[model samples]
Target: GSPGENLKHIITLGQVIHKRCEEMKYCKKQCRRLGHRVLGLIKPLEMLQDQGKRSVPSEKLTTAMNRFKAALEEANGEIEKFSNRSNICRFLTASQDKILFKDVNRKLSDVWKELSLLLQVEQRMPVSPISQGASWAQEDQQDADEDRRAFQMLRRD
Candidate 1:
């Protein structure tokens, strides 16, 4: 599939995860935080695909993107279980809730790492920087800010 289509799928899966996250009750706060992170990914994903179209594609890029897609789908599946669980089961499995949420957060961290790598590949691609570089720099700064907040949340939990 083309990068555009792939990116679209990724974003859709991310939103699905976000919705499931909101539906969770036990780890409500953490799940919602992760959902916000999923939403934050849109711009970066767009930029990565934009660069991919401009840059010469490679096996490396293709492999990385595919792995990211898999990671997202896996995370989506994990989160879905939380939303789908019966209220009684959630109460009975209260002790295990932390473990499950931790796993989801770890996967989300992986997702962020994969996206970061994709951005690196995009930066390394040859492109005219004239006006585009300025725009990228602005977005890159914002991404860094977002990363710092995400890391802090991860560290706390």
Candidate 2:
């Protein structure tokens, strides 16, 4: 059976936050190795632009990366604690309650866009399976399918 909507929502939010956290940690570690200070005074709002948050700002990208890493670590800890709860099961099984799934989804999407821009600033390329051209398409498809399966399991009730 499909997961109840609430459970699915929580899991999706958790996944997005988790992904950003990992990326942030990576960027931060790189900055540290280059001997850049990790923290700065700029808040997220200070960096926001008409397009969204600025691409980590050239001067502060390293510091922003470290800040993101710290945020990710804290958020991850929260997710772990929340996930162990019996309340989540209760929330999932409630058929008539209004779920905040949409809100969570929106927040995740916002973070994802910000992180994507940050990655661009860092000049990091996503791990790609297309390097081998058409010959690798089949393998890529299999990998994609497996990834979807894993994601589904995470989202399952």
Candidate 3:
């Protein structure tokens, strides 16, 4: 993707996952919820894009966006696996799909929460070295709460 195309790809991939997961048969409910979570990423992503347009691009911001894009791309790939299979096939393979979902779910949640917090922090101050230092510390502290949601959701079925 081009410089401007970064955000475009991120949003596009997110939308792709959203639609793909919606049509899935096996993990319909959880996948749709996953899609919705990815859908929620667009605005924050655009907000960061807006920040770039308004001011000089920060390394942290650019890296975050790039990683976010890559994560979404991976997510789209994983979600696509749940589609196009025979309904009975998916039922037989539900256990494997559950593992796949849990994997992507954890990964997606990690990056999503990181990006969300970065945006929230960037709102208050520029992405400075000092803030970057503190940001990791905060993320480290919040690690416990991060996968709890993913785990609970996985356990629901």
Question: What TM-score goes with each of the models?
Answer: 0.58, 0.28, 0.63
What is the C-alpha local distance difference test score of candidate 1? 0.54
Off by over 4 Å in 2: 1-59, 62-79, 94-105, 121-157
Ranking of models by lDDT: 3, 1, 2
Identify the runs in model 3 with alpha carbons over 4 angstroms from their true place. Answer: 51-56, 86-100, 125-157
- Better candidate by TM-score, 2 or 3: 3
Q: Pick the candidate with the highest lDDT.
A: 3
What stretches of model 1 exceed 4 Å from their correct place? 1-4, 51-57, 85-99, 124-157
After the best TM-score superposition of candidate 1, give how far the Cα of residue 45 lies from its true spot, in angstroms.
Answer: 1.0
Q: Can you rank all candidates by TM-score, best first?
A: 3, 1, 2
lDDT of 3 by residue, 1-157 (tens): 3566666677888888877767664444444555676677675566656655854456766676777776677766765654554532454245423333445555655666666667667665332222233343343324424433454544445
How does each model score on lDDT?
Answer: 0.54, 0.34, 0.57
Candidate 2, poorest ten consecutive residues by summed lDDT? 33-42
* Candidate 1: count of backbone clashes, pairs at least 3 residues apart or interchain: 0
* Residue-level lDDT tens digits of model 2 in 92-155: 3452222212122223334444554655455364521212333323333444344343333434
User: Which whole-number lDDT from 0 to 100 does residue 71 have in model 1?
Assistant: 56
